[PDB]
Amino acid sequence: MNIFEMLRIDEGLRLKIYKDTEGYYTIGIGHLLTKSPSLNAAKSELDKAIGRNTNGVITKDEAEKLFNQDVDAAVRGILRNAKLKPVYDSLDAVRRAALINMVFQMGETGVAGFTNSLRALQQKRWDEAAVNLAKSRWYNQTPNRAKRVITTFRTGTWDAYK
Ligand SMILES: [Cl-]
Ligand SMILES: [Cl-]
């Protein structure tokens, strides 16, 4: 298992514009298009993203290309974030994947704010981190996905995804 596979399971794959868990227009494998309430605005952001008039539909290859960029951007924002990088550098391969998942989902800023959980992860206090991560709007809005990531940090295995 790896990051791609992991996120592919958490986000799914949709080839037409859809609303995410927050009601925002999205496409592909969790590619957010816009927070605006307008489908037209979504369609425009979509064509700009793919470089063609899509009519709000893309192909699988196109979804995968957006995914590749998105995963890459997430890793890179982790590496540039002064709060995130030290954490990521301290972790093993499997837990690094869980930090990337959260960043993909919530954005770097959102993640950099789990101050307390970051500190526990960095100190390798697994159970403490897991408990703290659960006290979040994140866990209350998307509990099954959050439990999966949390278990990942707790155990350092892919068990939650098999
Ligand atoms: Cl260490
Ligand atoms: Cl809470």
What domains, with CATH codes, occur in the chain?
1-162 (1.10.530.40)
Tell me, in angstroms, the distance from the centre of ligand 2 to residue 135's CA. 4
Our separate counts of H helices and E strands in the chain read: 9, 3
Span from the CA of 50 to the centroid of ligand 1 (angstroms): 42
Host H or E run for residue 155:
helix 143-155
Q: Which phi-psi region, left, alpha or beta, contains residue 21 (left: φ > 0; alpha: ψ -120 to 50)?
A: alpha
Torsion angle defined by CA atoms of residues 94, 99, 102 and 107, in that order, rounded to the nearest 10 degrees? -150
Ligand nearest to the CA of 146: 2
Distance CA 56, CA 139 (A): 31
- Give the distance from CA 15 to its chain's centroid: 18
Alpha carbon of residue 33 to chain centroid = 14
Is 89 one of the annotated active-site residues of the chain? no
Strands ordered across the beta sheet of 31-34: 14-19, 25-28, 31-34
Angle of CA points 6, 12, 15, to nearest 5°: 135
Residue 20 annotated as catalytic? yes
Which residues does residue 28 pair with via DSSP β-bridges, in sequence order?
14
Cα separation, 87 vs 59, whole angstroms: 36
Q: Could you tell me the two tokens for 37?
A: 């309430």
b/e 28-43 (16+ beta carbons within 10 angstroms → b) = bbbbbbbeeeeeeebb
Q: Are 78 and 107 in contact (CB under 8 A)?
A: no
Torsion of CA 12, 13, 19, 24, to 10 degrees: 80
Closest ligand (CA of 124): 1
Distance CA(122)–CA(74), nearest Å, equals 19
